[model samples]
Target: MEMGRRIHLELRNRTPSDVKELVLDNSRSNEGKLEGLTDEFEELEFLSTINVGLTSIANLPKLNKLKKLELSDNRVSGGLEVLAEKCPNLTHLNLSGNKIKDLSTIEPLKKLENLKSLDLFNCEVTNLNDYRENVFKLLPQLTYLDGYD
Candidate 1:
């Protein structure tokens, strides 16, 4: 991901401590077969968002201050359970174009008390029975669904 490197370099050029968010959408990192894209930015505890193109992340262990994460237009099946537990500050999430088809897979998201918005625009799960009501019931913290906010 050249954009990821450029952003990292830009942050490095500055204090690097000023880093609060990372948006790497359409960089083709995963599409280009660069699997370990997240390994480089783990140190930015101030990061509030990470928008990338991937089916799944290798391991993003600590995202302490992350609020909004966008992993749209990929094939992420289900690993957000880890993030739902680890990223305590997560609020807005966009997994709009993935292949997540099971509501069971999204169950972990209910635990996030602060999560306010979620986007699952073109996923198979979106067509499920009582989808909106179920999602609203499960994640009562959600103020908006499928990026309607």
Candidate 2:
């Protein structure tokens, strides 16, 4: 139920004091290098996936260890550039049941060279023509779409 008026974070290779999708205090977003902070990141080792009731993708901390990010059921806009720049290790992304309408929204995902799965069930963009083919072409790294190949 906690919501920041706006997303705030820092970018580091893995953990600049980062987020492996942990339930963390934004107050620490300014914390310095996590070079020796494995102990802290380990605390959030289980929250590697996304969407902690997130409404936007703009606030996520730099979390390179993230493999699965579920931004489902939120009103997040097209800020996926942050995902590409921040969470490059993402493999599965679930943005189903949200409000994303533009195909361009997933453009940044192209940079997610390691992406394996993408789920866009029940979104405005899903209703568009050539959705599957377009997405397939956009993120070829995705071996599965909406839980399928």
RMSD (Å) per prediction: 3.5, 7.6
Q: TM-score for all predictions?
A: 0.77, 0.69
Highest-scoring model, lDDT: 1
Return the TM-score for candidate 1, rounded to 2 decimals.
0.77
Please provide, for model 1 over 34-87, each residue's C-alpha lDDT reduced to its tens digit, 9 standing for 90 to 100.
342343444443332234456565355566667877777777788667776667
Tens-digit lDDT string for candidate 2 (80-149) = 8877876777788888877778789888889998888888888888988988999898877789998876
Error of 2 at 59 (Å): 2.1
Inter-residue clash pairs, candidate 1: none
Task: List the pairs of residues colliding in candidate 2.
Answer: none
* TM-score of decoy 2: 0.69
lDDT of 2: 0.61
Clashes of each: 0, 0
- The candidate maximizing TM-score is 1
Candidate 1 Cα deviation (angstroms), residue 2: 4.9
